[PDB]
């Protein structure tokens, strides 16, 4: 019995953005939080206070509410997952397991499609604010004498914040999880010799196929969380100019804000995927204990 399916994400059609079920649903919202801190050090862009208090939160509420619209679509997929993962409750109606599988992907892709499409105007607002941000940075009076103290100051704060999260623990865990998961995949394939009946092994293979999706999700965020860590440190160990042009300071703020927001985003997803992978490991093993009892 899967009780929460918050591990389903959706990307835009051109793949620039990534929607998640957990707040704030976009790493773009965490960038907007970061830029709040940058505006504190610049008096000429003091209006970002009102941008953040009003427009960014109004985007977050509309994000959360447009997510809530997919609620019925979410449990429709959730109702199919529980049928396919539990042999006893698959027996409560006769539909070809293959047909029920096709219904699962229909409803799934329908549900994931709901996440994207009902958030079309919210990505429009992420784009607006981003353009709104860059127009506001024009009000900095420096033109080529722009100070990089803020930039390198925030880098120092990030590096301390990157120490807090246990990357190695997350990394060690997935290496063991994937290594054993593939072993169960090879085992089931090799052992269906002795199994006369497939419905409980079909439930095993379904959970294993959903275990693959979450693993890849886990590796994507882990790979992008490492990427953020590595490249901000790469900025902290390189040349440190103290002055730069106005347009390159915009790039600068957008760079570190991006890397940190993505990191905060990955941190939010890895904790959830970690739970999801453990929970699916209990359902699989219960069916394995189910499978072996029927071997007699």
């Amino acid at each position: 019995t899967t009780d929460n399916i918050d591990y389903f994400d959706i990307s835009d059609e051109s793949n620039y953005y990534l929607i998640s079920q957990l707040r704030p649903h976009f790493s773009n919202i965490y960038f907007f939080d970061e830029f709040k801190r940058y505006a504190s050090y610049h008096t000429e862009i003091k209006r970002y206070e009102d941008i953040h208090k009003t427009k960014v939160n109004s985007l977050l509420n509309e994000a959360s509410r447009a997510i809530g619209i997919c609620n019925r679509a979410k449990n429709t997929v959730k109702g199919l997952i529980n049928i396919l993962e539990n042999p006893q409750k698959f027996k409560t109606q006769r539909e070809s397991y293959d047909v029920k599988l096709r219904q699962y992907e229909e409803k799934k892709e329908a549900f994931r499609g709901c996440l994207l499409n009902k958030n079309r105007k919210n990505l429009d607002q992420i784009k607006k604010i981003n353009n709104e941000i860059r127009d506001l940075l024009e009000k900095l009076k420096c033109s080529q004498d722009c100070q990089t103290n803020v930039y390198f100051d925030m880098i120092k704060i990030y590096l301390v914040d990157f120490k807090k999260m246990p990357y190695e623990n997350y990394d060690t865990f997935i290496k063991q999880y994937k290594n054993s998961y593939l072993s169960g995949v090879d085992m089931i394939r090799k052992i269906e010799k002795q199994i006369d009946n497939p419905v409980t092994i079909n439930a095993i293979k379904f959970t294993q196929k959903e275990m693959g999706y979450i693993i890849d999700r886990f590796e994507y965020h882990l790979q992008k969380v490492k990427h953020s860590i590595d490249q901000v440190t790469a900025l902290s160990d390189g040349v440190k100019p103290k002055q730069v042009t106005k347009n390159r300071l915009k790039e600068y703020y957008f760079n570190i804000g991006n890397y940190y927001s993505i990191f905060k985003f990955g941190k939010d997803s890895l904790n959830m995927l970690n739970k999801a992978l453990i929970h699916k490991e209990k359902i699989v093993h219960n069916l394995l204990g189910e499978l072996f009892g029927h071997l007699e």
Partner: antibody
Amino acid sequence: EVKLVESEGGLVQPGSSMKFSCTASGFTFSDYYMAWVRQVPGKGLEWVANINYDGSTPDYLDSLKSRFIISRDNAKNILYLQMSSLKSEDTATYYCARETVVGSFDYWGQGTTLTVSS
Amino acid sequence: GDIVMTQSQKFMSTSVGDRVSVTCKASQNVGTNVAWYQQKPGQSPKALIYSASYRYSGVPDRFTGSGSGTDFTLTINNVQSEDLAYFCQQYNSYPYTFGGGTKLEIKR
């Protein structure tokens, strides 16, 4: 495309009051600062006041912070400028203007004439 | 309290084919925070350029903006009879302030 339509203007005696309004269409009212600008016929422009997105912080020209109130109704997409204790110096054509993130005025209404006279 | 934008020239003589630059002086350094407006006879002002140099969409490319710091200039290529007044505006600090305006005085 973007339309700013100001209420009818009028003639007022010194000391009385008049409230102007401005209805906005063709853009998300709540996404922009809005402002009022006044111009004496044949003369230059003068900024009067402006209002932020939710209407929490209005700001004015110091001389008029006393007598002028700017307000917004985001649900009805209308900007208001309430004036009190008016004088002859206040006679002008008042423009409803949409303010940029920086402080520019991207779009202007057609103006509404206020005449202060006995 | 005070920033003054000065358009010292109230009228500027020109011809229809010409290209003319209109100047606006700021009392202090306002960086790039300058915008340019036109006002034809009997019309509300219309925006042309912001950030001293950036042209709004749909504004003809015969309008160009230059300047930084305290001296800003609007350039109007291929003058037309329909052209008249031009106002500069600073949005660096409150209160916002406009220049006195400059009108083209065409010779025929």
